[PDB]
């Protein structure tokens, strides 16, 4: 069902180094989304290249891959109604300087290349990304819907 949609979010090495992990997780918890997967890791080049495959024909791909593998990342899966599009709205837009106050990039970022966090752009991409970053055994099996959040 609709309330069981999931998205993949990565706090990138800049977000981790700046001590923004808890702030970010708290925003998603307060919204009512449920954490169904979480880990810190240093991504491998193989994983990073697959993660960023949509950009592989562009010159900036190499820099995205080098950066995401340059230090720890906090990988997360959140679940809830419309979580893919909502999590993106909560992040802001590609340019942090154009991101509205209240959004994560709007409150915390200034540079496209140090954009703190990325989220899946679609349900199809989210399913692909979740399977890339997490083994099925690392994900919660089932979330009972909170009646205070869902009718």
Residue (of 136, 134, 108) closest to 12 by Cα position: 108
The residue behind tokens 């820099």 is 63
The three-state DSSP-derived secondary structure of 113-141 is CECCEEECCCHHHHHHHHHHHCCHHHCCC
Beta strands in the chain (DSSP E): 6-11, 34-41, 73-79, 117-119
d(CA 58, CA 107) in angstroms, rounded, equals 28
Return d(Cα 5, Cα 32) in angstroms, integer: 13
Cβ partners under 8 Å of residue 32, min gap 6: 80, 146, 149
Resolution of the model in angstroms: 1.2
* CA–CA dist 30, 12 (Å, integer): 21
Residue whose pair of structure tokens reads 């918890």 in the numeric block = 29
Which residues neighbour 24 within 8 Å (Cβ) at sequence distance 6 or greater? Answer: 9, 11, 15, 104, 116, 117
DSSP code at position 79 = E
37 neighbors 6 (Cβ within 8 angstroms): no
Backbone angles phi, psi at 139, to 5 degrees: -110, 145
Q: Which experimental method was this entry solved with?
A: X-ray
- 1-151: CATH class: alpha beta
* Residue 93 and residue 105 in contact, taking contact as beta carbons nearer than 8 Å: yes
Q: Report domain extents, the chain.
A: 1-151
- CB neighbours of 129 closer than 8 A, spacing ≥ 6? 8, 51, 120
Q: Which residues pair with 41 in a beta bridge?
A: 73
């Amino acid at each position: 069902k609709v309330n069981k949609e999931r998205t993949f979010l990565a706090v990138k090495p800049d977000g981790v180094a700046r001590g923004l992990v808890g702030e970010i997780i708290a925003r998603y918890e307060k919204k009512g989304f449920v954490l169904v997967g979480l880990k810190q890791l240093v991504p491998t080049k193989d994983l990073a290249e697959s993660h960023y495959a949509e950009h592989k024909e562009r010159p900036f791909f190499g820099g995205l891959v080098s950066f995401i593998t340059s230090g720890p990342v906090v990988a997360m899966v959140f679940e809830g109604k419309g979580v893919v599009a909502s999590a993106r709205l909560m992040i802001g837009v590609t340019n942090p300087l154009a991101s509205a106050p209240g959004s994560i990039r709007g409150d915390f970022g200034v540079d496209v290349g140090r954009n703190i966090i990325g989220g899946s752009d679609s349900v199809e991409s989210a399913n692909r990304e979740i399977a890339l970053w997490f083994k099925p055994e690392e994900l919660l099996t089932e979330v009972k819907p909170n009646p205070n959040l869902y009718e």
